[PDB]
Short mmCIF file of C-alpha atoms (C1' of nucleotides) and ligand atoms in Angstrom, two decimals:
data_model
loop_
_atom_site.label_atom_id
_atom_site.label_comp_id
_atom_site.label_asym_id
_atom_site.label_seq_id
_atom_site.Cartn_x
_atom_site.Cartn_y
_atom_site.Cartn_z
CA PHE A 810 -50.87 116.57 8.75
CA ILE A 811 -53.38 118.01 11.19
CA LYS A 812 -54.95 115.82 13.86
CA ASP A 813 -58.11 114.02 12.74
CA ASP A 814 -57.62 114.43 8.99
CA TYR A 815 -59.50 111.63 7.25
CA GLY A 816 -59.13 113.22 3.83
CA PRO A 817 -57.75 111.23 0.94
CA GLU A 818 -54.25 112.72 1.11
CA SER A 819 -53.71 112.25 4.84
CA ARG A 820 -54.73 108.60 4.92
CA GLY A 821 -52.50 107.43 2.08
CA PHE A 822 -54.16 107.94 -1.29
CA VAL A 823 -51.42 108.71 -3.79
CA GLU A 824 -52.75 110.85 -6.65
CA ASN A 825 -49.46 110.94 -8.58
CA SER A 826 -48.26 108.42 -11.14
CA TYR A 827 -44.81 106.89 -11.16
CA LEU A 828 -44.02 109.04 -14.17
CA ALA A 829 -44.85 112.42 -12.68
CA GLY A 830 -43.25 111.13 -9.47
CA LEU A 831 -44.53 110.73 -5.96
CA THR A 832 -44.53 113.66 -3.53
CA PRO A 833 -42.57 113.24 -0.27
CA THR A 834 -45.28 111.76 1.89
CA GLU A 835 -46.84 109.69 -0.86
CA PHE A 836 -43.35 108.25 -1.18
CA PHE A 837 -43.39 107.20 2.46
CA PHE A 838 -46.89 105.73 2.41
CA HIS A 839 -46.04 103.95 -0.82
CA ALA A 840 -43.12 102.52 1.10
CA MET A 841 -45.45 101.41 3.90
CA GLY A 842 -47.67 99.56 1.46
CA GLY A 843 -44.71 97.84 -0.16
CA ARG A 844 -43.22 96.63 3.11
CA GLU A 845 -46.38 94.60 3.58
CA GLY A 846 -45.55 92.86 0.31
CA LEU A 847 -41.97 92.03 1.27
CA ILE A 848 -43.01 90.69 4.66
CA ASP A 849 -45.72 88.36 3.33
CA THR A 850 -43.29 86.88 0.81
CA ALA A 851 -40.80 86.18 3.59
CA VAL A 852 -43.36 84.70 5.99
CA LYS A 853 -45.63 82.65 3.74
CA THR A 854 -42.89 80.56 2.14
CA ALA A 855 -41.90 78.95 5.45
CA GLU A 856 -45.52 78.06 6.22
CA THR A 857 -46.29 76.76 2.74
CA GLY A 858 -43.22 74.57 2.97
CA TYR A 859 -44.09 73.07 6.34
CA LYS B 1115 -68.19 89.37 6.57
CA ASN B 1116 -64.46 88.87 7.02
CA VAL B 1117 -63.47 85.21 6.68
CA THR B 1118 -60.03 83.66 6.63
CA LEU B 1119 -58.67 82.37 3.33
CA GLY B 1120 -55.36 81.45 1.83
CA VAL B 1121 -52.72 79.64 3.85
CA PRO B 1122 -54.08 80.51 7.34
CA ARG B 1123 -57.33 78.79 6.35
CA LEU B 1124 -55.40 75.83 4.96
CA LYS B 1125 -53.79 75.00 8.30
CA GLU B 1126 -57.29 74.83 9.79
CA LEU B 1127 -58.71 72.27 7.38
CA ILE B 1128 -55.50 70.24 7.46
CA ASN B 1129 -54.93 70.27 11.21
CA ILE B 1130 -58.69 69.98 11.86
CA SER B 1131 -58.31 72.46 14.69
CA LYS B 1132 -61.18 72.57 17.17
CA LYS B 1133 -61.42 76.36 17.19
CA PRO B 1134 -61.08 78.13 13.83
CA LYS B 1135 -60.39 81.84 13.77
CA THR B 1136 -63.57 82.50 11.78
CA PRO B 1137 -66.28 79.88 12.27
CA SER B 1138 -69.32 80.63 10.17
CA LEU B 1139 -72.67 79.03 9.41
CA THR B 1140 -74.76 79.80 6.34
CA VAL B 1141 -78.50 79.43 6.81
CA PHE B 1142 -81.17 79.13 4.13
CA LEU B 1143 -84.85 79.89 4.63
CA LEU B 1144 -87.74 77.69 3.47
CA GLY B 1145 -91.08 79.44 3.18
CA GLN B 1146 -92.19 83.00 2.62
CA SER B 1147 -89.52 83.97 5.16
CA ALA B 1148 -87.08 83.50 2.28
CA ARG B 1149 -88.57 86.13 -0.02
CA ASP B 1150 -89.73 88.77 2.48
CA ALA B 1151 -87.03 90.73 4.28
CA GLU B 1152 -89.44 91.39 7.15
CA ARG B 1153 -90.32 87.73 7.62
CA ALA B 1154 -86.59 87.00 7.41
CA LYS B 1155 -85.53 89.58 10.00
CA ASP B 1156 -87.94 87.81 12.34
CA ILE B 1157 -86.02 84.53 12.11
CA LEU B 1158 -82.84 86.62 12.19
CA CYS B 1159 -83.79 87.68 15.71
CA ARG B 1160 -84.38 84.07 16.75
CA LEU B 1161 -80.90 82.87 15.75
CA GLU B 1162 -78.86 85.64 17.37
CA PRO C 9 -80.37 109.18 38.51
CA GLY C 10 -76.78 110.17 39.17
CA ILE C 11 -73.50 108.28 38.94
CA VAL C 12 -73.24 108.44 42.80
CA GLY C 13 -69.79 108.24 44.42
CA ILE C 14 -67.76 107.30 47.48
CA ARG C 15 -68.08 108.49 51.09
CA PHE C 16 -65.33 108.35 53.71
CA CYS C 17 -65.47 107.94 57.48
CA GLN C 18 -64.48 110.93 59.59
CA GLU C 19 -62.31 109.09 62.13
CA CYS C 20 -60.12 106.43 60.50
CA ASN C 21 -60.86 107.90 57.04
CA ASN C 22 -61.85 104.56 55.57
CA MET C 23 -64.50 103.66 53.02
CA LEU C 24 -67.98 103.76 54.48
CA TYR C 25 -70.21 100.92 53.41
CA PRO C 26 -73.97 101.05 52.86
CA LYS C 27 -76.08 98.96 55.23
CA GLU C 28 -79.73 98.71 56.20
CA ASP C 29 -81.25 99.78 59.49
CA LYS C 30 -83.74 97.03 60.24
CA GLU C 31 -85.61 98.91 62.96
CA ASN C 32 -86.21 102.25 61.22
CA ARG C 33 -85.81 101.05 57.60
CA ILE C 34 -83.25 103.80 56.89
CA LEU C 35 -80.15 103.34 54.76
CA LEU C 36 -76.93 103.80 56.73
CA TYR C 37 -73.23 104.00 55.99
CA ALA C 38 -70.83 102.38 58.44
CA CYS C 39 -67.09 102.02 58.50
CA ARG C 40 -66.17 98.45 59.26
CA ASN C 41 -63.16 99.36 61.42
CA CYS C 42 -65.11 101.52 63.93
CA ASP C 43 -68.68 102.11 65.12
CA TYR C 44 -69.10 105.32 63.11
CA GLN C 45 -72.45 105.50 61.32
CA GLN C 46 -74.08 108.14 59.15
CA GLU C 47 -77.50 108.42 57.57
CA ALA C 48 -77.77 108.11 53.79
CA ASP C 49 -79.02 111.30 52.19
CA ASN C 50 -78.83 110.13 48.57
CA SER C 51 -80.76 106.81 48.99
CA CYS C 52 -79.16 105.40 45.80
CA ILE C 53 -76.24 103.02 46.14
CA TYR C 54 -74.90 101.23 43.07
CA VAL C 55 -75.59 102.74 39.65
CA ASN C 56 -74.21 101.40 36.38
CA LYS C 57 -74.59 102.96 32.94
CA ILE C 58 -74.49 100.20 30.34
CA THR C 59 -75.74 102.27 27.41
CA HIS C 60 -73.17 104.76 28.71
CA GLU C 61 -74.16 107.73 26.64
CA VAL C 62 -71.26 109.89 27.74
CA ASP C 63 -70.94 113.66 27.79
CA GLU C 64 -67.51 114.50 26.40
CA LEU C 65 -67.93 118.21 27.17
CA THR C 66 -67.07 117.24 30.75
CA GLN C 67 -63.79 115.54 29.86
CA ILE C 68 -62.53 118.13 27.37
CA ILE C 69 -59.86 120.45 28.74
CA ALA C 70 -59.88 124.12 27.82
CA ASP C 71 -56.09 124.09 27.45
CA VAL C 72 -56.52 122.11 24.21
CA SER C 73 -56.86 125.47 22.44
CA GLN C 74 -53.07 125.91 22.47
CA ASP C 75 -52.17 122.90 20.34
CA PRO C 76 -50.77 123.81 16.89
CA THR C 77 -51.68 120.40 15.52
CA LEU C 78 -55.40 120.79 15.75
CA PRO C 79 -57.42 122.42 12.96
CA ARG C 80 -59.46 125.54 13.42
CA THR C 81 -62.22 127.34 11.57
CA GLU C 82 -63.55 130.86 11.68
CA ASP C 83 -66.86 129.48 10.41
CA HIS C 84 -68.24 128.73 13.87
CA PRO C 85 -68.09 131.73 16.22
CA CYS C 86 -67.91 131.33 19.97
CA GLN C 87 -71.30 131.07 21.64
CA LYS C 88 -70.33 133.06 24.73
CA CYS C 89 -68.02 135.91 23.73
CA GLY C 90 -68.54 135.70 19.97
CA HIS C 91 -64.96 134.85 19.05
CA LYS C 92 -64.37 133.60 15.53
CA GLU C 93 -61.57 131.10 16.09
CA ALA C 94 -62.64 127.64 17.23
CA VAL C 95 -60.32 124.64 17.37
CA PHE C 96 -62.31 121.48 16.73
CA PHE C 97 -61.46 117.81 17.19
CA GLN C 98 -63.16 114.44 17.43
CA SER C 99 -63.78 112.20 20.45
CA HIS C 100 -60.13 111.18 20.92
CA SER C 101 -61.65 108.51 23.15
CA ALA C 102 -61.45 104.75 22.93
CA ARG C 103 -64.76 102.95 23.50
CA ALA C 104 -66.64 105.99 22.18
CA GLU C 105 -69.18 103.72 20.43
CA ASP C 106 -69.51 105.40 17.00
CA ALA C 107 -68.91 109.15 17.08
CA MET C 108 -67.33 111.33 14.43
CA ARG C 109 -68.98 114.35 16.07
CA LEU C 110 -66.68 117.35 16.31
CA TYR C 111 -66.27 119.09 19.64
CA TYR C 112 -65.40 122.77 19.57
CA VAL C 113 -63.09 124.66 21.90
CA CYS C 114 -62.95 128.44 21.76
CA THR C 115 -59.56 130.03 21.20
CA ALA C 116 -58.51 133.46 22.56
CA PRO C 117 -57.20 133.54 26.14
CA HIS C 118 -59.26 132.27 29.08
CA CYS C 119 -62.60 131.86 27.27
CA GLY C 120 -62.28 128.08 26.99
CA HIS C 121 -65.94 127.60 26.09
CA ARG C 122 -66.65 124.13 24.75
CA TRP C 123 -69.65 123.31 22.57
CA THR C 124 -70.81 120.64 20.16
CA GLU C 125 -72.67 120.91 16.86
"C1'" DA D 1 12.01 76.60 53.81
"C1'" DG D 2 8.76 79.73 51.77
"C1'" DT D 3 6.72 82.10 48.07
"C1'" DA D 4 5.62 82.79 43.33
"C1'" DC D 5 4.76 81.31 38.76
"C1'" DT D 6 3.43 78.05 35.40
"C1'" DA D 7 1.01 74.12 33.76
"C1'" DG D 8 -2.61 70.90 33.82
"C1'" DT D 9 -7.08 69.47 35.02
"C1'" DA D 10 -11.97 69.93 35.90
"C1'" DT D 11 -16.48 71.94 35.09
"C1'" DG D 12 -42.23 91.70 25.29
"C1'" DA D 13 -43.73 90.36 20.40
"C1'" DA D 14 -45.43 80.50 20.07
"C1'" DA D 15 -49.29 78.28 19.55
"C1'" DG D 16 -52.04 74.14 20.19
"C1'" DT D 17 -53.13 69.62 21.82
"C1'" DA D 18 -53.21 66.03 25.06
"C1'" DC D 19 -53.10 64.20 29.56
"C1'" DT D 20 -53.68 64.40 34.51
"C1'" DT D 21 -55.69 66.08 38.59
"C1'" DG D 22 -59.27 68.09 41.26
"C1'" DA D 23 -63.88 69.24 42.19
"C1'" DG D 24 -68.64 68.57 41.92
"C1'" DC D 25 -72.77 65.91 41.34
"C1'" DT D 26 -75.51 61.80 41.53
"C1'" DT D 27 -76.58 57.32 43.15
"C1'" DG D 28 -76.54 53.67 46.43
"C1'" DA D 29 -76.34 51.89 50.90
"C1'" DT E 1 -77.55 61.56 55.01
"C1'" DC E 2 -73.02 60.29 53.86
"C1'" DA E 3 -69.59 58.25 51.05
"C1'" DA E 4 -67.78 56.69 46.83
"C1'" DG E 5 -67.33 56.78 42.02
"C1'" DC E 6 -67.41 58.88 37.64
"C1'" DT E 7 -67.28 62.77 34.52
"C1'" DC E 8 -66.01 67.26 33.13
"C1'" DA E 9 -63.22 71.25 33.10
"C1'" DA E 10 -59.04 73.60 33.84
"C1'" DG E 11 -54.19 73.91 34.14
"C1'" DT E 12 -49.71 72.52 32.98
"C1'" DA E 13 -46.26 70.45 30.08
"C1'" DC E 14 -44.18 68.90 25.75
"C1'" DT E 15 -43.18 69.19 20.44
"C1'" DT E 16 -42.69 71.39 16.23
"C1'" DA E 17 -41.64 75.95 13.37
"C1'" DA E 18 -38.37 76.11 4.20
"C1'" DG E 19 -35.49 74.30 0.42
"C1'" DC E 20 -30.61 74.27 -1.30
"C1'" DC E 21 -25.89 77.06 -1.56
"C1'" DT E 22 -21.56 80.57 -0.74
"C1'" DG E 23 -18.39 83.17 2.30
"C1'" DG E 24 -15.99 84.67 7.22
"C1'" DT E 25 -14.20 84.58 12.41
"C1'" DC E 26 -13.33 81.99 16.53
"C1'" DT E 27 -12.96 78.13 19.87
"C1'" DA E 28 -12.55 78.55 28.05
"C1'" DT E 29 -11.27 80.10 32.39
"C1'" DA E 30 -10.37 79.22 37.06
"C1'" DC E 31 -8.47 76.72 40.57
"C1'" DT E 32 -5.21 73.57 42.47
"C1'" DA E 33 -0.87 71.30 42.67
"C1'" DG E 34 3.90 70.88 41.74
"C1'" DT E 35 8.36 72.64 40.73
"C1'" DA E 36 11.95 76.02 40.77
"C1'" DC E 37 14.30 79.98 42.55
"C1'" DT E 38 15.47 83.15 46.07
ZN1 LIG F 1 -64.35 104.71 60.37
ZN1 LIG F 2 -65.17 132.51 23.33
#
DNA sequence: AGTACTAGTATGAAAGTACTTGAGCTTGA
DNA sequence: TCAAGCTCAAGTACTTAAGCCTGGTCTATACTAGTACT
């Protein structure tokens, strides 16, 4: 992407559905949004148990 | 207005920590300053 | 008003300091490590911009026009030489307050003209 | 008698709360 | 006006960070003293 692109594609909006398949970058951003799910689930359990 | 919720807010109430991440105070207005936005912004300037 | 600036002594090359002449009521600068004194021409000493409306056209470098990663439009022609390519970018500055304003830098060699719309 | 080898013994990217110490201010002599 | 006492604030030090379960690999070295061989 070009510097200072605030458009929907550059900032992570994925316009493809799992069926048509994600394009390369949308695959990476989709992986960045899923890492935040894995991390929370690993962190919160040890706090909710203490 | 971003406030803390979920488990991070639960440690605050339980531990009764002196300094919460997000202290907040809701304020209600009595007279005509409640209905009018202009009369309200006046009190708004007095609290800030 | 001016953002003022430093002055240096001419002997030990230290920082001159402003001081007041009590007899003539004239602002002076004096190094503290010698007797050198000089009269203040500017008459302003300490100036501080809190609102700090800042002119970015002073910070922008003309060499920016060589970056492939910046966008460019032929919509906005150069103001000086009338060149069509202009490579525009935002503040790129922390503590910019709120600015999405684009700054324009003229491409083509050595023009380097920098404007804002 | 001296030297070498082997065996045994000796030693960056925590956070928060509470307590103690120091400094400053006020009162009394 | 000076000294003493009390209170407040700041800095430093001490205690905790999930529950159960399955596998594996690895565990001193150095110095000194005594004994044996050349
Ligand atoms: Zn000097
Ligand atoms: Zn130009």
